[PDB]
């Protein structure tokens, strides 16, 4: 069966088609309102930017999180926003990913050869490490219930300090943990190592996300970013 807690987590998941179409609609108006005069890396910054907006709106209306004061909500989101972008990216490839291509949040499918030629050494290396996580999570049969659990484990991080209500974050971290432990037992009893193999991806996701953060900030300092959007603001703080 499914622990009641995991059911409550699922009821906070947005309708994936609605957020994809919404982001696609946004980017279509951006370029449509551009002239024929006047990149791809920039086109991803804005895709990742709009994905951040949906991530914020998801957490905002999510159980437990909606009971935190705004100061606490900001500390949690400031700590994990990059992790959620990566985790969201990884899960999209597990679900829709085909070998040799990237599925974007707008639903578009892009060939690797096109991305690899432009991304650069660092981003290529970070994307490849993410694909290794994709292959692993696909071989474990990473499903939606396990996905939302990891989302909340990333969100309610014990690494976040100076919270007014750290006890709530601690409890959510623990009850989500116990629920995932019980979910993988009932629904995947043969996989004695599934639970552990899912948790071991969170530090790997963290490391990729922090490295991605540092690199994008480098590109911002270097002058290679559309300026002042939400993406840049999260990098500042």
């Amino acid at each position: 069966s499914i622990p009641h807690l995991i059911l409550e987590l699922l009821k906070c998941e947005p309708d994936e088609p609605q957020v994809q179409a919404k982001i696609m609609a946004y980017l279509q108006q951006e370029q449509a309102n551009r002239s024929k005069h006047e990149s791809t890396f920039g086109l991803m910054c804005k895709m990742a930017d709009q994905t951040l907006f949906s991530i914020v709106e998801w957490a905002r209306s999510s159980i437990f999180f909606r009971e935190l004061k705004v100061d606490d909500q900001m500390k949690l989101l400031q700590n994990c926003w990059s992790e959620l972008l990566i985790l969201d990216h990884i899960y999209r490839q597990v679900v829709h990913g085909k070998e040799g291509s990237i599925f974007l949040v707008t639903g578009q499918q892009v060939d690797y050869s096109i991305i690899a030629s432009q991304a650069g050494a660092t981003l290529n290396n970070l994307m490849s490490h993410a694909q290794e996580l994709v292959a692993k999570l696909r071989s474990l049969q990473f499903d939606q219930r396990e996905f939302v659990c990891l989302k909340f484990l990333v969100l309610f991080s014990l690494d976040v300090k100076n919270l007014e209500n750290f006890q709530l974050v601690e409890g959510v971290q623990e009850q989500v943990n116990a629920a995932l432990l019980d979910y993988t037992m009932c629904n995947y009893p043969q996989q004695t190592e599934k639970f552990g193999q899912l948790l071991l991806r969170l530090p790997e996701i963290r490391a990729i996300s922090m490295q991605a953060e540092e690199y994008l900030y480098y590109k911002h300092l270097n002058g290679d970013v559309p300026y002042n959007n939400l993406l840049i603001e999260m990098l500042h703080a």
Binding site: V56, E57, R60, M74, L77, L230, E233
Partner: peptide, 11 residues
Amino acid sequence: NALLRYLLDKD
């Protein structure tokens, strides 16, 4: 982070 607080406060 002015924009983040806005996204959490806006109605």
